[PDB]
Amino acid sequence: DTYKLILNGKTLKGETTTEAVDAATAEKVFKXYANDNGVDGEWTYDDATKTFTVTE
């Protein structure tokens, strides 16, 4: 399935999707997009849209 990440940095904002078998593969692609943009923060998940958000 298509999983999405919304990257909500303080100033650096972005979005990305990855095709993955499970959510917690997608989350661990997304944490390493997030951290390697140099952006960390609180993490949420929306099951209905398969979308993570990291908010700095």
Side-chain angles (χ1 to χ4, degrees), residues 3-6 30 44-53:
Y3 287 85
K4 174 182 282 235
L5 170 82
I6 300 172
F30 288 160
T44 41
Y45 179 69
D46 183 58
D47 163 53
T49 52
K50 289 176 159 75
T51 297
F52 296 85
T53 313

